[PDB]
């Protein structure tokens, strides 16, 4: 089950402005982005703020700590730059930023690169120099997904951008997956064998359609660290998500649970030990105009 364990809000603020979350490499600590562009560190059990940093002059939309604890990616709403890389050892400082990329992720196997998304276009950057290594855009193969988000595969040799599979080393598009929806561009399963693009599960080897999973329609997904469970939440047609998230067995795509929290969801994350789930939820009735979010901690 998902037993509520604890809840907290942005300390001392009339209106709590948490917008996104990620567990730190440091156990017992959660990182939260806010609607004023700050990064907060919270002790996740006491619900007490420990540190605060200034990152952007607009709402943080998403963040991602590096596994080793040394680096953090942030993205914002209206800032220039829209995304940035921060060092977290000794002094919290901006290392590099990514002009107009509104989404960024680390590479997966070795976290030496950043992949940023601007619309239908992917940009790959070197973490050391900040230099743009690659622009990935193929006018013949584009799907023009409205919520595109480029991503590396588990071994970093492939990228999926706009439903197109790229060989990174050669910088060539090797396959376009056919379009079935307007918005969602897809992710790699952690198993290395499958691509999940909205409701379609494709085999990487053959490019054959393996499964259709209707419940994944319009969902962002994240897997637990062991890659046994997949969490999905449907984007809203303001909070990025509706009031529900769903779990699925990552091995067979069979559903496990649907959780309706009856509040708009902003973000969800799990810890490295897959002990806990943190969900950012707006308080009030559904689609409240008032912004007053909490972070709920659930025991998986």
CB of 143 to ligand A1CSX, least distance (A): 13
Which residues sit at the interface with ligand A1CSX, rule CB under 6 A?
20, 61-62, 77, 102-103, 147, 149, 220-222, 231-233, 240-241, 245, 265, 267-269
CB of 43 to ligand A1CSX, least distance (A): 20
The smaller minimum CB distance to ligand A1CSX, of residues 61 and 198, is found at 61
Residue sitting closest to ligand A1CSX (CB) = 233
The smaller minimum CB distance to ligand A1CSX, of residues 61 and 224, is found at 61
d(CA 165, CA 172): 9
The smaller minimum CB distance to ligand A1CSX, of residues 202 and 241, is found at 241
Is residue 199 within 8 A of residue 259, CB to CB? The reply is no
Could you give the C-alpha distances from 242 to 61, 62, 227, in angstroms and in order?
16, 17, 24
CB of 121 to ligand A1CSX, least distance (A): 13
CB of 145 to ligand A1CSX, least distance (A): 8
CB of 169 to ligand A1CSX, least distance (A): 26
d(CA 184, CA 238): 19
Q: Residue 31 forms beta bridges with which residues?
A: 22, 41
The smaller minimum CB distance to ligand A1CSX, of residues 59 and 91, is found at 59
The smaller minimum CB distance to ligand A1CSX, of residues 147 and 175, is found at 147
Task: Show the tokens assigned to 203.
Answer: 């085999």
Strands 209-212 and 200-203, how do they pair?
Answer: antiparallel
d(CA 300, CA 145): 33
Is residue 184 within 8 A of residue 198, CB to CB? The reply is yes
CB of 35 to ligand A1CSX, least distance (A): 11
Cα Rg of the chain (Å, integer)? 18
Q: Residue 75, CB half-sphere, CA atoms under 13 Å: how many? A: 18
Cβ contacts of 97 within 8 Å, gap of 6 or more: 81, 83, 84, 85
The smaller minimum CB distance to ligand A1CSX, of residues 128 and 258, is found at 258
């Amino acid at each position: 089950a998902f037993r509520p364990i604890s809840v907290f809000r942005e300390a001392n603020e009339d209106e709590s402005g948490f917008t996104c979350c990620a567990f730190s490499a440091r156990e017992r600590f959660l990182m939260l982005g806010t609607c004023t562009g700050q990064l907060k560190l919270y002790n996740v059990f006491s619900g007490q703020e420990e540190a605060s940093y200034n990152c952007h002059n607009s709402a943080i939309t998403h963040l991602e700590p590096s596994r080793d604890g040394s680096l953090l990616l942030t993205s914002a709403t209206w800032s220039q730059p829209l995304s940035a890389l921060w060092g977290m050892k000794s002094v919290f400082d901006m290392k590099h930023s990514f002009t107009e990329d509104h989404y960024v992720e680390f590479s997966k196997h070795s976290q030496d690169r950043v992949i940023g998304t601007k619309g239908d276009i992917a940009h790959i950057y070197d973490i050391q120099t900040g230099n743009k290594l690659l622009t990935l855009f193929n006018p013949d193969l584009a799907n023009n997904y409205k919520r595109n988000c480029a991503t590396f595969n588990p071994t970093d040799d492939l990228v999926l951008n706009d439903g197109v599979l790229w060989d990174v080393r050669s910088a060539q598009a090797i396959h376009k997956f056919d379009k079935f929806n307007m918005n969602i561009s897809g992710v790699f399963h952690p198993n290395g064998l499958e691509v999940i693009i909205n409701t379609e599960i494709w085999d990487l080897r053959t490019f054959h359609l393996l499964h259709t999973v209707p419940a994944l329609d319009q969902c962002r997904v994240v897997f637990n660290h062991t890659g046994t469970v997949m969490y999905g939440a449907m984007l809203q047609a303001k909070s990025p998500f509706g009031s529900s998230f769903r779990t699925f067995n990552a091995t067979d795509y069979k559903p496990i649970a649907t959780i309706d929290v009856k509040r708009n969801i902003f973000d969800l994350c799990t810890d490295t030990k897959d002990c806990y789930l943190a969900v950012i939820e707006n308080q009030g009735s559904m689609d409240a105009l008032n912004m007053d979010t909490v972070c709920r901690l659930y025991e998986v």
